[PDB]
Ligand binder design. Structure first.
Ligand SMILES: [NH3+]C1CCCCC1
Length: 270
């Protein structure tokens, strides 16, 4: 229906959007710097996520029940968590790269060599993976809220249904730490980038605004709901609209960090 065709659009958009990043960057021997390796890796992560999770998840929400079979479920949701705890981390390390240009600008190249960038890619793909799988594979969403998951007998649907202290921990680490680093950085860049045009006069707001705005509107609603419910009036059907918000964010990530800019456009429009 409306939902079906519409959600397929998003998945395809993600796939075609990111293969572009990866084709342009790997073989051009004009783009061999430390920064691009991040937009490459984010492309990769969003790609994998898109293709495997999205279509499985897309089957699930045009229905009330998961019927794939339960041995599969746990694998699946952990993959969803891992791949996105990856996307948010990627945005934060890009922030540090950008902070480091517009502050210590005499030392930048030395500090951001390809070795640093390598650590930044391994950490991004390691800690999300591990944590998601370890948590959901040792019966650790529910420890104390076991019966409910009533919520999985009749409902039998893969919902990350979190326990009381589960919501606080998961929400905190992935939204609160990655969210805060970003805000500090962009705040300072507003004051410096706008302060300079004082001197040269005798743009910043649009760019920085559009980056932070996207992230927040796409994630704040799903995550706020999540920490709250262990304190359970929320409904099942409405709760779903929030997952898909995260997935939509993933597409627009390529447009915001690798196409708004002229170098990409010119090289791609060769
Ligand atoms: N959709 C999921 C992504 C992060 C973990 C909990 C929600």
């Amino acid at each position: 229906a409306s939902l079906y065709s519409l959600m397929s659009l998003i998945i395809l958009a993600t796939l075609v959007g990111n293969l572009i990043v990866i084709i342009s960057i790997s073989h051009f021997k004009q783009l061999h710097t430390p920064t691009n390796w991040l937009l490459h890796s984010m492309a990769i992560v969003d790609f994998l996520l898109g293709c495997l999770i999205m279509p499985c998840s897309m089957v699930r929400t045009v229905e009330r029940c998961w019927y794939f079979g339960e041995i599969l479920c746990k694998v699946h949701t952990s993959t969803d968590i891992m791949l996105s705890s990856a996307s948010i981390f990627h945005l934060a390390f890009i922030s540090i790269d950008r902070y480091c240009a517009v502050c210590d600008p005499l030392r930048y190249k030395a500090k951001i060599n390809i070795s640093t960038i390598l650590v930044m890619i391994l950490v991004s793909w390691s800690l999300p993976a591990v944590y998601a799988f370890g948590m959901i594979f040792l019966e650790l969403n529910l420890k104390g809220v076991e019966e409910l998951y009533s919520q999985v007998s009749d409902l039998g649907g893969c919902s990350p249904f979190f326990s009381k202290v589960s919501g606080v921990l998961a929400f905190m680490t992935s939204f609160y730490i990655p969210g805060s680093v970003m805000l500090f950085v962009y705040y300072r860049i507003y004051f410096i980038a706008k302060g300079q045009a004082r001197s040269i006069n005798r743009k910043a707001a649009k760019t920085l605004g559009i980056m932070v705005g996207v992230f927040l509107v796409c994630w704040c609603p799903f995550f706020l709901c999540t920490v709250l419910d262990p304190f359970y009036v929320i409904p099942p059907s409405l709760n779903d609209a929030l997952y898909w918000f995260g997935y939509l964010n993933s597409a627009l990530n390529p447009m915001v960090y690798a196409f708004f800019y002229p170098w990409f456009r010119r090289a791609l429009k060769m």
